[PDB]
Design a protein around this ligand. Structure first.
Ligand SMILES: [Mg+2]
Ligand SMILES: [Mg+2]
Ligand SMILES: [Mg+2]
Ligand SMILES: [Mg+2]
Ligand SMILES: [Mg+2]
Ligand SMILES: [Mg+2]
Ligand SMILES: [Mg+2]
Ligand SMILES: [Mg+2]
Ligand SMILES: [Mg+2]
Ligand SMILES: [Mg+2]
Ligand SMILES: [Zn+2]
Lengths: 128, 118, 82, 155, 206, 60, 25, 99, 92
RNA sequence: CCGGGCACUCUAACGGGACUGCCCGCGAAAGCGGGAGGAAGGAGGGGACGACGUCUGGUCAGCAUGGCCCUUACGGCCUGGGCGACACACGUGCUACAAUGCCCACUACAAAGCGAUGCCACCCGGCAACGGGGAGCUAAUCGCAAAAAGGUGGGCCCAGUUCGGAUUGGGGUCUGCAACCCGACCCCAUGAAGCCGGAAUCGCUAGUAAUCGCGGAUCAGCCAUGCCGCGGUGAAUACG
RNA sequence: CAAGGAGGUAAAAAUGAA
């Protein structure tokens, strides 16, 4: 029906966020924003930028997600939701900065380095 | 109920209670009660005496178990008595049968450490 | 553990079968456990190599899947100080 | 040699509550990095608080932490091959950390069967001033009490 | 010590390859062995030329081979031999397009392989090594170089005691990537053993 | 046993399982990559030489 | 029971499949 | 209809030689789908840095094999004429098939 | 009497006469030493000037060391008329 | 999945992007602290890069090479044995002692790589390993793979116990000329020690430790619980 | 504000290689 940007990424996760101006606070992809994310406590934190603004269900969510696991996807959705409402509302910048909902968060899994057992964990020794 | 040579397991699921017999384990367990046609999740507490009879009659027959098959197993090792093979000597010396590492480990057949020192 | 093969040495069997018609002498060697116990010629002795010498092993039924060299230990051990 | 004073790590606020404290507690619950199971247990126990008492877990948990706060603790210091134990004050950061740590530990010390009921009960006991963690807190303050002699070494 | 090969350290940016062909599996192994046997066969009966490089290129039975030499004196005009069957003897285990070219390395005093090889000859001539090192460096530095460094290690002047003679003028930054640093090496065979000569030649970049 | 041993490695008859890899540049029997037909030692040498087409240092 | 050959978990760890871990569907 | 593939170890030679064929096909009467960047097949291997026996601290190498695709529409012998045997690679392997 | 070896080359030279485990020019040298350590009824007999005998210190305590040639030493434990753990080691 | 379109995602090639440049303060300067500035900052987070030299360090068994030695042999071929021996001692590890746990069923969410002298979809037999077929794939096309921890449901109820899997009997399968010494799996039955570790001792400061599975090299097969990589969920604390 | 001269000083921790 409609379109509003959408590019949220966090630790190898890609989420395209749209939102369509309608009172139906809806979902996307598999099932519900619930259902697909049930049993997961921190899953509902992706909708916090909407709480930061005046959106108590004014948009119809549409986020296709891929890559990583749920938590990264959820994190990426947060970046995409914010990337939408900051796009078609350029004055909604003065809340995405103090609250910091706009950052790709470069925190990604560090490489296995040789010698070490895994990333940084040293292989443990005895002199004797 | 004195099923085979044992009777012990009371209030604890017949599919589990069965396990408490040398010869039953876990696979023969549910296999025996599906072939006898009895609910696995039952109390074991002396339920329907008929189910118990059928169970006993099937289980105790069919395949060898308890003290009888312990005797057969011990006799299969006694096979390599006579002038037996290499595998027999491993049962003789008390060392691991399957040719594994004995430089360390192998404590489950050797037993606890003895320590020589020198 | 073979099933459709279940093999014995051809050369062990050649020597074993052509010396099986109406009787023989127990003088028969080999160099391979590789084979199998072989029914017939049960009342026989097969000098199996253990890496050092030829040990006369004797067949008296009882044995089958155990080829030969299981009846020919290669090590000695014997004791560890005690 | 700590050239940097190591800035205080800040957390994410939880769901439904907004705590700047509860998440720190959920983290201590967390083992092997499973925040799902960790958070669930706490919120589970929060539901358990509602049953045995008609109190909102946001205060029951809050007061429990406040009751398991070490005013002063014992610190081993200088001269004599580190022979002394100066009783020192406890920083608000450290009272914070000890409270939550002792809570979870004492909680798993309990003979109960489910992790949630251990958390819930240990919190209710601690809110009253009865918990095994409160024992630990009061114990650490005994040690700090008995060392007032060379407390003047201070620092 | 322990330092990485200044050639391999570049390879990508600065200093390109020496055998430039593409293949997938089932072919790479065979074509690399042939390629190396070309380098092996050439080095033998072409040392008197003193070859700085042996570039090789391929394109399905095309095998181009470029031999860089200070003085291509051993080529001698078309049918004057020293090329005919010589570039044709390659295809006795190849049979492919043995396209053998010859390059003229202008200044041998700026070619690291040639420098080290001249030094390694002098070791076998029983020359005074320390003086030989000094001269070769200045000789390289005399021909416009931005920096040079020669290294002979082990068994210097015979005598039971492995040594390491060291000399270097100007600038030689090995750590920098935009370096254009030529590296050469040579085995000096002596009646008392074997010693290795390293030669570093540096020019600007950016 | 080294010269007559790099003979067998190319000879390869008599049972298919008796055949084995072997570095060509050297005579190494261990750590022999099927891709190059070289041992890990030789492979490193030539990779620094530049005589290995496409082969380049790995940094990431 | 990562080392028990009679679990979907031990069969994972071992890699192989079987009766206690079928090759899907 | 004509599909051409260009594999290569050097990306700079590929990104240039497979761009020549975009110019030599466009200026001969055809529509050309530009340099399609197929993903790379990186072939790494890790070797112990020393000839001795120093297991910790080694050094690894990689052999990146690049793939690039280009499609031209009508197989007219006007565009065919140029891309027939006017090949300028350095060993770059080229595949030409129509389906 | 020599009763146990730690060095295989040493072991082979004294037992089978296999000389391929030691230096070729030290064959006669090592031999006369081993026979001396074999005939020795006490450590006092292994005291000829050309052996430079001495017991080792530290973790090698209980061991002895006669000199073959240069930086090379034959080390062993002498006890009750017998030497044990005959090794062929380095001065550094 | 088609028509069509390629703006999103992605793919891979060149670029832009902070240089504490800008504000307040400190200072002689360098610089330090603080603040809007943006994805990012006062070397952004990781790699590759290891000075003169030290250890008579390491490697003549990768290779090269001075010297010493062996040559009907210290060389060459073969079958077999051995490197896998076991009263013991030490290193690095794997799997655990359980209920923030175990079993069964259902149901999701990855990345990095490997394959047509192979990966092998889908059917058929089989409790299963696997065998019979047999389509596609010179591979962002087909296949290896369903990621697992997670979620939902249900069952055990704290007990050497549905924890734990060692050891042992039996029955099978696959590679291989052949698996007794000495192969990996599958299935039935056994189910040991261990209820959390003495003196001591190790690792890690942010996607980090922990925990979870996934690929590759070698490789007929495999003794890999190893090594080199990949991503999933994701702490604690630093006064000094 | 810028210090001269004044005085209480570590612990329990020994050895050395060929
Ligand atoms: Mg990880
Ligand atoms: Mg290691
Ligand atoms: Mg640098
Ligand atoms: Mg030395
Ligand atoms: Mg040699
Ligand atoms: Mg070994
Ligand atoms: Mg016990
Ligand atoms: Mg218990
Ligand atoms: Mg650090
Ligand atoms: Mg003394
Ligand atoms: Zn080699």
């Amino acid at each position: 029906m409609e379109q509003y940007y959408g590019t949220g990424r966090r630790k190898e996760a890609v989420a395209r966020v749209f939102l369509r101006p309608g009172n139906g606070k809806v979902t996307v992809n598999g099932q519900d924003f619930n259902e697909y994310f049930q049993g997961l406590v921190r899953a509902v934190a992706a909708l916090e930028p909407l709480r930061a603004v005046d959106a108590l269900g004014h948009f119809d969510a549409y986020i296709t997600v891929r890559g990583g696991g749920k938590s990264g996807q959820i994190d990426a959705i947060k970046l995409g939701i914010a990337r939408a409402l900051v796009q078609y509302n350029p004055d909604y910048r003065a809340k995405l900065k103090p609250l910091g909902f706009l950052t790709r968060d470069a925190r990604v899994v560090e490489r296995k380095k040789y010698g070490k057992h895994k990333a940084r964990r040293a292989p443990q020794y005895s002199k004797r | 109920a004195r099923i085979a040579g044992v009777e012990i397991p009371r209030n604890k699921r017949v599919d589990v209670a069965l396990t408490y017999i040398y010869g039953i384990g876990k696979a023969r367990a549910k296999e025996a009660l599906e072939k006898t046609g009895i609910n696995p999740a039952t109390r074991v507490k002396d339920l329907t005496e008929a189910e118990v009879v059928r169970l006993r009659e099937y289980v105790e027959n069919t395949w060898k178990l308890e003290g009888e098959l312990r005797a057969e197993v011990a006799a299969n090792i006694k096979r390599l008595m006579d002038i037996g093979c290499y595998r027999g000597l491993r049962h003789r010396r008390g060392l691991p049968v399957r040719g594994q590492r004995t430089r360390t480990n192998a404590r489950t057949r050797k037993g606890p450490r003895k320590t020589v020192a020198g | 553990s073979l099933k459709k093969g279940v093999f014995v040495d051809d050369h062990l069997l050649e020597k074993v079968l052509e010396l099986n018609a109406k009787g023989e002498k127990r003088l028969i060697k080999t160099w391979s456990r590789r084979s199998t116990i072989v029914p017939e010629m049960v009342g026989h002795t097969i000098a199996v190599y253990n890496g050092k010498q030829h040990v006369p092993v004797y067949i008296t039924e009882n044995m089958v899947g155990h080829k030969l060299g299981e009846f020919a230990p290669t090590r000695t051990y014997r004791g560890h100080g005690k | 040699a700590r050239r940097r004073r190591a800035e205080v790590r800040q957390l994410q606020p939880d769901l439904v509550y907004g705590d700047v404290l509860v998440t720190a507690f959920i983290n201590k619950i967390m083992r092997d990095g499973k925040k799902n199971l960790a958070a669930r247990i706490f919120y589970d126990a929060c539901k358990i608080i509602q049953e045995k008492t008609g109190q909102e877990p946001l205060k029951v948990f809050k007061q429990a932490v406040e009751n398991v706060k070490p005013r002063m603790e014992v610190r081993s210091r200088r001269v004599g091959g580190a022979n002394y134990q100066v009783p020192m004050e406890v920083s608000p950061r450290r009272q914070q950390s000890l409270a939550l740590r002792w809570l979870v530990q004492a909680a798993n010390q309990r003979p109960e069967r489910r992790a949630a009921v251990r958390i819930a009960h240990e919190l209710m006991d601690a809110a009253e001033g009865k918990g095994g963690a409160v024992k630990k807190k009061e114990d650490v303050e005994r040690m700090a009490e008995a060392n007032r002699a060379y407390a003047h070494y201070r620092w | 010590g322990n330092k990485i090969h200044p050639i391999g350290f570049r390879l990508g940016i600065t200093r390109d390859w020496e055998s430039r062909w593409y293949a997938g599996k089932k072919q790479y192994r065979h074509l690399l062995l042939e390629d190396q046997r070309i380098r092996g066969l050439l080095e033998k009966e072409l040392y008197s030329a003193g070859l700085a490089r042996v570039d090789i290129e391929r394109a399905a039975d095309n095998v181009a081979v470029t031999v860089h030499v200070a003085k291509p004196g051993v080529v001698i005009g078309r049918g004057g031999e020293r090329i005919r069957v010589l570039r044709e003897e390659l295809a006795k285990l190849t049979g492919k397009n043995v396209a053998l070219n010859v390059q003229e390395v202008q200044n041998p005093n700026l070619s690291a392989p040639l420098v080290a090889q001249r030094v390694a000859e002098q070791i076998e001539r029983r020359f005074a090594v320390r003086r030989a090192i000094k001269q070769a460096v200045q000789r390289v530095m005399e021909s416009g170089a931005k920096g040079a460094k020669v290294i002979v290690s082990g068994r210097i002047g015979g005598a039971e005691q492995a040594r390491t003679e060291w000399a270097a003028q100007g600038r030689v930054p090995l750590h920098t990537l935009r370096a254009n640093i030529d590296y050469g090496f040579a085995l000096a065979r002596t009646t008392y053993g074997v010693l290795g000569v390293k030669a570093y030649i540096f020019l600007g970049e950016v | 046993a080294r010269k007559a041993l790099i003979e067998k490695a190319k000879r390869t008859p008599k049972f298919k399982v008796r055949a084995y890899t072997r570095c060509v540049r050297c005579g190494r029997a261990r750590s022999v990559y099927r891709f190059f037909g070289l041992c890990r030692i030789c492979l490193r040498e030539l990779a620094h030489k530049g005589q290995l087409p496409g082969v380049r240092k790995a940094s990431w | 029971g990562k080392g028990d050959r009679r679990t979907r978990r031990g069969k994972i760890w071992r890699g192989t499949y079987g009766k206690y871990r079928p090759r899907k569907k | 209809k004509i599909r051409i593939k260009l594999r290569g170890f050097d990306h700079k030679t590929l990104d240039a030689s497979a761009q020549k064929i975009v110019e030599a096909a466009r200026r001969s009467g055809a529509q050309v789908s530009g340099p399609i960047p197929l993903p790379t097949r990186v072939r790494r291997f890790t070797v112990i840095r020393g000839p001795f026996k120093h297991k910790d601290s080694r050094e690894h190498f990689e052999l990146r094999t690049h793939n690039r695709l280009v499609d031209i529409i009508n197989p007219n012998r006007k565009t065919i004429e140029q891309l027939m045997t006017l090949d300028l690679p350095t060993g770059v392997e080229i595949e030409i098939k129509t389906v | 009497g020599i009763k146990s070896f730690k060095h295989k080359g040493l072991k082979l030279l004294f037992e089978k006469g296999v000389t391929s485990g030691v230096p070729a020019q030290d064959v006669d040298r090592i031999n006369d030493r081993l026979q001396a350590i074999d005939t020795a009824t006490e450590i006092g007999e292994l005291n000829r000037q050309i052996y430079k005998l001495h017991p080792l210190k530290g973790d090698r305590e209980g061991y002895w060391s006669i000199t073959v040639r240069a930086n090379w030493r034959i080390t062993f434990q002498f006890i009750n008329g017998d030497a044990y753990i005959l090794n062929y080691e380095d001065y550094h």
